[PDB]
Amino acid sequence: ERPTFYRQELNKTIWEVPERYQNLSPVGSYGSVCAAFDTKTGHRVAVKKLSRPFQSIIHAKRTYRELRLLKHMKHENVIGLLDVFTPARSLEEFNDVYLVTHLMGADLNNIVKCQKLTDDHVQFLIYQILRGLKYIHSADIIHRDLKPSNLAVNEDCELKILDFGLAHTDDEMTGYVATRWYRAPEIMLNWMHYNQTVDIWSVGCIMAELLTGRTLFPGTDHIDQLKLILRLVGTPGAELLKKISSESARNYIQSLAQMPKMNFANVFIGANPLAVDLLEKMLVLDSDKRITAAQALAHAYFAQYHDPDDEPVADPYDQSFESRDLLIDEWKSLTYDEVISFVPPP
Ligand SMILES: COC(=O)Nc1cccc(NC(=O)OC)c1
Ligand SMILES: [Cl-]
Ligand SMILES: [Cl-]
Ligand SMILES: [Cl-]
Ligand SMILES: [Cl-]
């Protein structure tokens, strides 16, 4: 049952992998990644060797979290898990984890900056993001880090969501950085407990950029970005102010001069009127009032692509481990069980 493994040192790293994976070639370095040819399936694949997966309780729980999430995702518009392996023959010598996925080429950046997009292209790309999100949200999963570099696109305009937020540092979110330009205001400034509606804000930011070729809210810091957002969508009323839990944050908002919501047809000049209408329903300051992924799929902007018999939901996903307190070796044993129970797709 156990395959034969072979060892090799590539760029100061030891890689021990099953014989099926050939012609390993480093491509990036969290973990290190190699491209390879999988002789069992015929696919070009990415093989990621996790870096120090069990060095702390926090790191061991993050390793388990990532493996549980990747094993669950089975949808055309979401990255899935092709294989997971360890060279260890027992729990006692278990130390290294390797994850195998389809090798992705271009991301949405490699097209948004370098192609001329028709409205039909925007329809199809945003449709696929929303189709994947309906699936993800049905399992009570929040992606949290949707942005163009986390969307893989091929030559036929087919799209997959990847790089789920596994819980970014303070430094990474500081200044003039794309890591923050797509984040909902309530999570950027920790206004309140957030939920899956944060992902819909991100989709609105992405759709605007596909239509205009420009970043929607390219703030130089958190406060500059908030000012760009409030100039477009308006300052909050008392109803949303009630829902912001920090007194200082409420005090800060009330120090700003009030502004009305702008006319989106005069911002997205020349855009399909149905695209303008959908943007107005995603880019709503109060997260309770944003359109959901399931509701957006039925919007008339997608009439050409919507098929309610081919927009599936996910199997239920048990996240009870997140509130559980365990020792490093217990998280490590749970991870080992998940490695050895993996069953590959058809
Ligand atoms: C700051 O200028 C704007 O207000 N709007 C803008 C800028 C650049 C491109 C587009 N394009 C667009 O809307 O295509 C549908 C719109
Ligand atoms: Cl996949
Ligand atoms: Cl090992
Ligand atoms: Cl990006
Ligand atoms: Cl005022």
Ligand SMILES: [Cl-]
């Ligand atoms: Cl589950």
Ligand SMILES: [Mg+2]
């Ligand atoms: Mg990424």
